[PDB]
Structures are given as structure tokens and as C-alpha cells.
Design a protein around this ligand. Structure first.
Ligand SMILES: CSC[C@H]1O[C@@H](n2cnc3c(N)nc(N)nc32)[C@H](O)[C@@H]1O
Ligand SMILES: CSC[C@H]1O[C@@H](n2cnc3c(N)nc(N)nc32)[C@H](O)[C@@H]1O
Ligand SMILES: CSC[C@H]1O[C@@H](n2cnc3c(N)nc(N)nc32)[C@H](O)[C@@H]1O
Ligand SMILES: [Cl-]
Lengths: 272, 272, 272
């Protein structure tokens, strides 16, 4: 196994890896957000990638999701575990809580969601990837059991609505998303989750709630500074969860799980 | 009358027409998906066009809806009847059922939906086309009565949600679409239906359900291979329905219906 | 204070201003829709801008929202009050009624919604603007009290759903939008409201309902001609409301309100 880690806002710390070497790569879809950081957690090979770049320079609409996933695939990653900062759409999901999300609702509009775009020899045909179960259940289960072992406030499921951004939602939108069954809100899960599935990678997401979105009365206003402060306070939780989870993934059996993902990916392609 | 036929996935068979001649055309909006196939059904002139191209090469996001409709308009089509493969969002819409859809919900994001884009001398101004009744009721009624005459399982109405694709929906999305009142799901109805209306064409759609989308428990997973297999099993139904419907359209009175569409189209344009 | 006025469909009359001088400007985001019209209402400096251009030439998808707001910002506008023609999604919002909207739901797909797009030296970084309260409450309150003083049918709140257009909604869409909590429907509020907020401008909207959208039974069909006719009949109301409101804004205290908007705008930017 080899674990890709895509680090989100306030949740991307190279110091998580030992024996670090940076590696700039190129892909048929362009350059990834930043250099790949190759390293290890205990005996497990990992590849860390900052979603928003070295200096947090890249807006969610313009993150190169294709290049990021393709680069991790080419580096040999069998798994991708990510972190993402999000807002809470449910009273029971408190700021600082982790949510091991199991569904999404797409509200993005400007984003390529397939490698198979008719313009790349490396991905020929039309791909219709199944999304009934977008996140790897086995990885999610190890995250859930590990969060429990650590005593962390963690939710075992949740539906992430991904908005285009970069603005936050209106209050009317926040309310509407709750009625649609969304539990947490962010700007990056789609199309990252979709492209991972096309690549035949086991993908899971550690979502960190930083605030209640503006549906909720009598809370502080949603703001960049409040998001960043809450992340600073809680980032250690994601780091511990990754550090403790990854060696357990490394000693689990994956051949069958990975073979089924590979088959799903290859059989989703219509060839001419 | 002259009937344009846009054939969808597994539902585009040139052998439906007699006296066939292929004709490659160009439009101010680019090239259509494939050559126009000119021919006849009994005494009625028809024009068949494969939505996804000769070799099923074109993803739904990149189908040239403008060129397809413009080409059929220029060829003299008064009517466009299409086929489309779709998923079912309702228990009563079984795989293999036909749905004569009467509404849509747009979930597409990347698609031009008007000929009047400010860049074409052939379509000057701003067009705000009415969409309260997107599909031609008279054609729909002939399809419905003909399906009954053939003894086919057919639904007399239905709301198609068109997603951007090319991925299938998440389970959270599938559930949400049901709450919005969607009955079937596909990737091509919008903007095809909109552009037909701008062109003053009577447009109707034969939607063929191939599976229950992933909202439904205890069904096979949604997949390309299962969609194609179900289409192979049921394609004869769409072919018979078209073959039997088209001569009845050819002997019906349309002058008033077509005049009202023409007026609606022309009066929807704001000129400078 | 200096009041930007963006005039919508049938609701853009230069004769509202005295001492008029036209001024064509350029911006880092391109040219605004038309010349800025500098003038006065009583003693208050104003800048009028036709949203759709001189000759109503520009479709809602292609209005340069960035250039319009940037141009008004650069001209020194502290406030932007706009007019917009809309459809009603509620029985109680009758054609001819004004709605002082306080929320939106975005259904647009093709539109830049930030100045901070990574390509402009004038707007560096990533901006995540809060949208819990998208419209300036103090301006809205002056509009509401002024409409009452004028005896006008006016609604003190309302949620605008902005669709991509240029087509009108399907009936299935119209119904769905009501379930989401939308009250009125248009094609221009987003991203205009978002960009104003990024610019630190107090923004409010005078929405004029021209018809019931097609959810409602036993009404005339929605059409361009009917929209324009209803606007012709009711445009005087918006003109009076603006004329009477603007001198009251000009004699109100704004330093604190504007300072808070400025802080919100500047603190929403993540720098590298
Ligand atoms: C630094 S500010 C931008 C970051 O904030 C995260 N985030 C937190 N709370 C919310 C919220 N309520 N709504 C939305 N859309 N995003 C939110 C978002 O995913 C992104 O990672
Ligand atoms: C060959 S695989 C792609 C084809 O499958 C049709 N289709 C069938 N079932 C579904 C479903 N459940 N969801 C969605 N989105 N599309 C579906 C779709 O319209 C396209 O024609
Ligand atoms: C001249 S025709 C185009 C103009 O009509 C306004 N408008 C009025 N009624 C409706 C309606 N029912 N639905 C939608 N989308 N827009 C509507 C719309 O905002 C634009 O300002
Ligand atoms: Cl939507």
C-alpha cells in the first residue's frame, strides 16, 4: 500500500511525515497544487500534497483536481485520505468535530469531473463512474474505529454539500441545503472524490467542522478568521487521527478491495 | 412535415429508415455529432442523427446541442422526436419502461442553452424562451396512444432531471432529486429541449428507463454494462414506437401548432 | 455618500438624474455594460449604469458583473441600489408589486463571482466573502419606509432565486424553487450582490414582479412581451421610490456601516 494525503486548509503539515523528500511532478492534466512530499508514517509509504498550494494561493474553483489525483495515482498511491475544513449544517456536529463523510451533494458548476474529456490520450473514451458509494467503506471504518480509540468527537457518517465558492452560502442557501439532507458544507470534496474513483483509488475524507454555517441562530458570524482560528485549535486531532490510522491501513488486506475498484473503473469506460 | 430523429445510447439504428443517404453538414455553431441520415418511414421524410456520434465517442457535456438542432432545423424538420436512455427515480417506472416525459429539471452547468449568444449573425438579440410546457403536447399524445396500441409499458408523463455527468449521481443526490419531483434521470435532455423550442420545432422525447438509480435498495448497482444490456433487450420497443408513430404524425394537421411555436420563438427575442 | 444605480430591464431611465454627464470607463475586469451616467438627485451624487447596455443588447449570462461593480467602486460609490425585473413565486406577490429582497438562492452556473480570481494584481489572494446577510439592512429599511410613505404595494422581505437563463424556468423548476423557499425569480441578482459585498459597498435591490411564473394556474403565459408591458405600466413606481429614497440616504449617518463592510471585505481575503 501507499497512502496519498491531500491536506486541506489549516490541516496540511509536512511534519506528519518522516524521511521527507519533495518531488515536483507534471501530469497530462497540468501541474499539481504543489510538490509531492514523499515520506513515511511508521513503515508505510506516504505522499502528502497541499490542496491549496505551498502558500495557500489557490481558490477552490481553480484547484487542479485532475492533476492532483493523477499525480498521486502515478506515484503508486493505492489509497488517498484527505482532510477538509467545513461548516456544520447540524446542531449535533459541533465546531471541532470530525465527520467521516459517506455521501456528497454537488453544487459546483465550473469544474471538470472526469479524466476522460476527449482531449487526453492517457484517458480515452467516455467514463460514467458509479457514485452510489463515493467513499471507500473499509478506510472509513478504520478512521471511525481509530477516532473512537483516540476518544475524539467523531461522526460516523455525513453528507457533504460542495459549493462552487469562493463565497460562503447565503442564509437561504444554508437552510435549503439542510432540507436536501446535507450535514456539512465545503468547497473541495467534488470533484476530488469523483476523480479518485475514476483512478481506482480507495478515497476517504476527514472533514473537520469549524463553525455552524449561517442557518443557526445565536452563533458567531462565519468568517475566514474564525475558520482559521478553529482549525488552529483542532488541527492536532486530524494529525493524530492520520498518524494512528495509516499504520492500521498498512497492515490490512486490500487486494480484493483494490481489484473491485479497478474493475469498476475500467468497466465504466465506453470505448469507440 | 419532416421528422428529425435524434437517437440516444443503444437507441440509434439507421435501419429504421428506408432509402438512406448520409449527408455531412456544417452549421454556424459547428459540426453536428455525425452525418445526417436522410430517409423515409412509409411516406414520411425523416432525418436521423446519432446524439453521441458514429462510434459513441462524445460525452454528454460535449455534445454539440446547438449544431444538432440547427442542422435539423436547416434540413427542414418540423418535428424532432428523440430517444434517450435514463435511470428511474420511481418504483413504478421499471427498467424497460418508456416514459413520455413532459417536464425537466436542469442540473447541467457547462452548457450553452441558447442560439442567441451575441456571437452569431444568424441569431441576433437576446432570447428568453418560455419553458412552462417544454415538450410538444400533440406529438406526446400520439406517442402515448401508439405505445398503448402496441401494448407497451409506457408512462404518460414524467419529469426528467438532466445532470451534467459524465459521472452517475451519488445516493444523496438521487434521494434529493426524488424530493424535487424528478421521475427519471439522464444527461442529455437539457439543453436539447430548450434549443428545439428556440428553433420553433415540435420536440418530444421517448425516454427508456434502464435501471433504478441508486436511491432504491436491493437492486443491481448502476453501471455502464448494465445500462447497455438493458438497452439491447429493450431497443426494439423504441424502434417499433417510432415506426408506428411517425406515419400518424405525417397524416395529422400541424399548421396551427407550428405557427404558434414560430410566433413564441420569434416573440421571445429582444432586438436592439 | 455617492449612490450607484444599476438599472434593470424597463427600469433604467437616465431622466431620473439632473445635471447628467456620460463617462465611459475601463476596468481591470473589462468594460462596464455602458457609459456611467453621472448626475444628481437633489443634492446627492449618483452614478447610473444600464445593466443590459444602451440598447438592451447583453444576455444575463454575459453581463460583466465584475466590471460594473468595479467601475462603480472606482467612481466612489458608497451605496449601490439596483432595479431588477422578476417573476413572482408567491400568490401574495402580485404583478406590479415591489419586493425589497433580503436573501438569494444561486442557480447560476457560468459566472465569475469574485474579483479575487488569481489573475488580477488589483485583487490579490483568495476571498471568501460572508453572505449570511447579502443586502444592506439600513438601505433596505429606508426603501421599505419610503415605499410605505408612497402608498406602494411593497414586500419587506423576499428570497430571489437567480437562474442562469436566458430561458425561463420549466414548470417543474418553478415548483421546486417554491419548495426551496424562493419568493421571486430573476437572472441577474447573483453575482452582482456578491461582488458588491467584496467591494465593501452597501447594496440593495428593488425587485419588481412582472408576472407569476408558470407554477401558478389560470394566469397568462410568461413571455418577453408581457414582462415588458407590465414594466411599462409600473416603471414609475421604481422611479418614484428611487427619487424619494436617495435624499434620505444622503442625510443618514453611514461611517460605521461602511467601516464594518470595509473590515468584512478586507478580512475575508487570504493572502500568501
Ligand atoms: C479559510 S475560509 C474557507 C474554508 O472554510 C471552510 N468552511 C468552514 N466553514 C464553512 C462554511 N460555513 N461554509 C463553507 N462553504 N465553507 C466553510 C471551507 O471549506 C474552506 O475550507
Ligand atoms: C451507457 S451509460 C450512460 C447512459 O446511461 C443513462 N442512464 C441510465 N441509467 C442512469 C442513471 N441511473 N443515472 C444517470 N445519470 N444516467 C443513467 C444515461 O442517460 C446515459 O444515456
Ligand atoms: C424581458 S424578459 C427577461 C426579464 O424578465 C424577468 N422576469 C420576469 N418574469 C420572470 C420569470 N417568471 N422568470 C424569470 N426567470 N425571469 C423573469 C427577468 O428577470 C428578466 O429581467
Ligand atoms: Cl442546484
Amino acid at each position: 500500500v501507499k497512502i496519498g494525503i491531500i491536506g486541506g486548509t489549516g490541516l496540511d503539515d509536512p511534519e506528519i511525515l518522516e524521511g521527507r523528500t519533495e518531488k515536483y511532478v507534471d501530469t497530462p492534466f497540468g501541474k499539481p497544487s504543489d510538490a509531492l512530499i514523499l515520506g513515511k508514517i511508521k513503515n508505510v509509504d506516504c505522499v502528502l500534497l497541499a490542496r491549496h498550494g505551498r502558500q495557500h494561493t489557490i481558490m477552490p474553483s481553480k484547484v487542479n483536481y485532475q492533476a492532483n489525483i493523477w499525480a498521486l495515482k502515478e506515484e503508486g498511491c493505492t489509497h488517498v485520505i484527505v482532510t477538509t475544513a467545513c461548516g456544520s449544517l447540524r446542531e449535533e456536529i459541533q465546531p471541532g468535530d470530525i465527520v467521516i463523510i459517506d455521501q456528497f451533494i454537488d453544487r459546483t458548476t465550473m469544474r471538470p469531473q472526469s479524466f476522460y474529456d476527449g482531449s487526453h490520450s492517457c484517458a480515452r473514451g467516455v467514463c460514467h463512474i458509479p457514485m452510489a458509494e463515493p467513499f471507500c467503506p473499509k478506510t472509513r471504518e478504520v478512521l471511525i474505529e481509530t477516532a473512537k480509540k483516540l476518544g475524539l468527537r467523531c461522526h460516523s457518517k455525513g453528507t457533504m454539500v460542495t459549493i462552487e465558492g469562493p463565497r460562503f452560502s447565503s442564509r437561504a442557501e444554508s437552510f435549503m441545503f439542510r432540507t436536501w439532507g446535507a450535514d456539512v458544507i465545503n468547497m473541495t470534496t467534488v470533484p476530488e472524490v469523483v476523480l479518485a474513483k475514476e483512478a481506482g483509488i480507495c478515497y476517504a475524507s476527514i472533514a473537520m467542522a469549524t463553525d455552524y454555517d449561517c442557518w443557526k441562530e445565536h452563533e458567531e458570524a462565519v468568517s475566514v478568521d474564525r475558520v482559521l482560528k478553529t482549525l488552529k485549535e483542532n488541527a492536532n486531532k486530524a494529525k493524530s487521527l492520520l498518524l494512528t490510522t495509516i499504520p492500521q491501513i498498512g497492515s490490512t488486506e486490500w487486494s480484493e478491495t483494490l481489484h473491485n475498484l479497478k474493475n469498476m473503473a475500467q468497466f465504466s469506460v465506453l470505448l469507440p
